[PDB]
């Protein structure tokens, strides 16, 4: 009798590289370099697309950011034409403030409990339209209650009851004209001082015309602080002051009671697709150890290499005939 | 391969063997047949899966790093940031290239090795009852029906049973 020993072969072999040979055919191989993205920055993740919403706007509530005031997110996507503000102004320490928010997890809001006696608090503007002229959702605009009436020296203290450090934002208003300040807040010296156990500073309006944006020569500037638990922020002002109505609490400081921990905030021009590794080209699978898509990455990512392909043999040498 | 079985004294692979990587083909009084060897097949597959387990699904988390694209000329510090990243990529590109070349050489050698082990094991089983024809085939010097062939494949072949018949056939004129 005859007994022959042998091995299999396939008609469709794959060429791989070895130590001694540039081109050798094996029965099967797998690709080690990820070379494509689906074109979207992300399935299985909780994501929010701010869209028109600027990110900082989530804190103080322009009409844009109406949906996203109390958002809960694992992944947060900023967008390019987004405007943080309805009435022209800018945040102090702006870039630093966003980085806080991106990694927040989202934000929870609770009222600071402020109440007012003799003032207009319902200040509205052409800039925040919203069915009818309006203001920031999360703040109150304070006015004399009778035009040209000198504004009251007032004091507010709010104390951070919660375990998570609170986020507090306030405004200084620089009026369109020296007149408008007068009409709004009365006349004479205007001083605003903000006091916390780690924080104190004093602000004064410097009223003037500035280039007309959103139809307003006037500006509002936002200053923010982080308040440790059990700490009082004291607000003292004779006017020109935009007041926080609500405190912002991060979700990744929650006690596992709202708690949605640790988000990654990205900047993307791509659509979304719910069908771990992010590149500027879009998210990429991370099953492969290497990738050729982008040297810039975030997350659990394959390592960037220059090769476009690297085949790992997963079968024996292919010897047909 | 370094053992010289696959692409060596075994002239070619069998496309018609689709139930295993290694196996037996026989010809006897009852006909011609083919049967896969599961143990050697699984031994090769386990080693390859061991390699895959080291490479697949084990990436490492990175978060905040350095910038790697720049919109303005800055000189010194930007030269340094670019050089650091370029250095890192070349070193990882080297690691990846060598890893694949080394693993592949080894995969081709281990699969050749499993084939050789099966051949050597079979040879020892047959004792003085068969001769190696030099192409991975044994000439068996006795009547060996399907059950006999089967006993060889499953390691229950008793050479003493056939030895007298085999020796007379081998050593004559």
């Amino acid at each position, epitope marked *: 009798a005859t007994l022959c020993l042998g091995h299999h072969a396939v008609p469709n072999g794959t060429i791989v590289k070895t130590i001694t040979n540039d081109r050798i055919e094996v029965t*099967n191989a*797998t690709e080690l370099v990820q070379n494509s993205s689906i074109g979207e920055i992300c399935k*299985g993740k*909780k994501a929010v697309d701010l869209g028109s919403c600027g990110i900082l706007g989530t804190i103080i509530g322009p009409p844009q950011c109406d949906l996203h005031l109390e958002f809960k997110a694992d992944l947060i996507i900023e967008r390019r034409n987004s405007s943080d503000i309805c009435y022209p102004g800018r945040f102090t320490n702006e870039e630093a403030l966003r980085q806080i928010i991106r990694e927040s997890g989202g934000i929870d809001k609770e009222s600071m409990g402020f109440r007012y006696s003799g003032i207009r608090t319902d200040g509205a503007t052409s800039a925040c339209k919203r069915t009818v002229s309006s203001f920031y959702s999360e703040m109150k605009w304070l006015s004399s209650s009778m035009n040209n009436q000198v504004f009251p020296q007032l004091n507010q203290t709010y104390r951070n009851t919660r375990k998570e450090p609170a986020l507090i934002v306030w405004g200084v208003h620089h009026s369109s004209s020296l007149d408008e300040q007068n009409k709004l807040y009365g006349t004479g010296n205007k001083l605003i001082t903000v006091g916390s156990s780690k924080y104190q500073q004093s602000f004064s309006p410097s009223p003037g015309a500035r280039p007309k944006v959103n139809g307003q020569a006037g500006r509002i500037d936002f200053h923010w602080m982080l308040l440790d638990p059990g700490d009082t922020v004291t607000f003292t002002f004779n006017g020109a002051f935009i007041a926080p109505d609500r405190a912002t609490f991060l979700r990744s400081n929650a006690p*596992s*009671g*709202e*708690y*949605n*921990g640790k988000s990654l905030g990205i900047q993307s021009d791509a659509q979304i697709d719910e069908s*771990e590794c992010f590149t500027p080209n879009g998210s990429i699978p991370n*099953d492969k150890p290497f990738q050729n898509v982008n040297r810039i990455t975030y997350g659990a990512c394959p390592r960037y290499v220059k090769h476009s392909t690297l085949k790992l043999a*997963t*079968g024996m040498r292919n010897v047909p005939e | 391969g370094i053992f010289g079985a696959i692409a060596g004294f075994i002239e070619n692979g069998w496309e018609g063997m689709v*139930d*295993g*990587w290694y196996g037996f083909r026989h010809q006897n009084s009852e006909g011609r047949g083919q049967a896969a060897d*599961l*143990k050697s*097949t*699984q031994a090769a*597959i*386990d080693q*390859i*899966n*061991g390699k*895959l*387990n080291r490479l*697949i*699904g*084990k990436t490492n*988390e990175k978060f905040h790093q350095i910038e790697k694209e720049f919109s303005e000329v800055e000189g010194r510090i930007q030269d340094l940031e670019k050089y650091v990243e370029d250095t890192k990529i070349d070193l990882w590109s080297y690691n990846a290239e060598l890893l694949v070349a080394l693993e592949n050489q080894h995969t081709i050698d281990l699969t050749d090795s499993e084939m050789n082990k099966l051949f050597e094991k079979t040879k020892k089983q047959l004792r003085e009852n068969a001769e190696d024809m030099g192409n991975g085939c044994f000439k068996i010097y006795h009547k060996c029906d399907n059950a006999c062939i089967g006993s060889i494949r499953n390691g229950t072949y008793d050479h003493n049973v056939y030895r007298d018949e085999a020796l007379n056939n081998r050593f004559q004129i």
Partner: antibody
């Protein structure tokens, strides 16, 4: 539908033998692996053994390394488990569980991929070992 | 031959809150790790395999993570029917082992 049904079990004296069947019905072509997992009421899960292709497993836990033996009958599509030399602590609800592996592993369809996770569990058969 | 320890033995979480579980494992393990949801009087059901890859047609509120030794399982939006016990297995030592089990409460 990939459900399997466990038959057999019951009350046995310590030291006796008992085999439990597992009718593998449905999507399973039975070129994939299968496993047994036992759990006693009042205790957690514990993997017992596994089977692959033909005789590729040979995979038993250290508790039953010398007692339990796993059979496979692909012609009638039923998985077995001969539990010999049963002791008192062998009283458990033996579950027959499907086995799935990532598609990168399991090169040859029949043989064992040494990384399996159980996806479809069975109804379970309770086996009590006392005097 | 490779013990698995879950923490804690039982946890109380209000419905809606996120419940994070622990699956500490002696010796390294990354490739294979499966989570299960065994409701009382029922067989275990696969939730996540590998480490983070969840099973087919299971809710997205079940999240998985971990590497080598420390592994976590977080249930985003909790429901009253999630009162099951959760387990975690590992590779390989040619001998898979299960976890002790984590009881989840919902007043």
């Amino acid at each position: 539908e990939v459900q399997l049904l466990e038959s057999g079990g019951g009350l046995v004296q310590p030291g006796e033998s008992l085999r439990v069947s597992c009718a593998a019905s449905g999507f399973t072509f039975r070129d994939s692996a299968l496993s047994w997992v036992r759990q006693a009421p009042g205790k957690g899960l514990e993997w017992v053994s596994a089977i692959s292709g033909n005789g590729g497993a040979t995979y038993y836990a250290d508790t039953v390394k010398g007692r339990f033996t796993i059979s496979r009958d692909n012609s009638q599509t039923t998985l077995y488990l001969q539990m010999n030399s049963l002791r008192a602590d062998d009283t458990a609800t033996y579950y027959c569980a499907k086995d799935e592996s990532p598609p990168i592993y399991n090169l040859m369809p029949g043989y064992y991929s040494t990384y399996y996770y159980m996806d479809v569990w069975g109804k379970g058969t309770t086996v009590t070992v006392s005097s | 031959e490779i013990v698995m320890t879950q923490s804690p033995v039982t946890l109380s979480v209000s419905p809606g809150e996120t419940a994070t579980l622990s699956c500490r494992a002696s010796q390294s393990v990354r490739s294979n790790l499966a989570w299960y949801q065994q409701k009382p009087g029922q067989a275990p059901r696969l939730l996540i395999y590998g480490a983070s890859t969840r099973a087919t047609d299971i809710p997205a509120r079940f999240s998985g993570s971990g590497s080598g030794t420390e592994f976590t399982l977080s249930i985003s939006s909790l429901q009253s029917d999630d009162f099951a016990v959760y387990y975690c297995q590992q590779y390989n030592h040619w001998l898979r082992t299960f976890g002790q089990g984590t009881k989840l409460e919902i007043r």
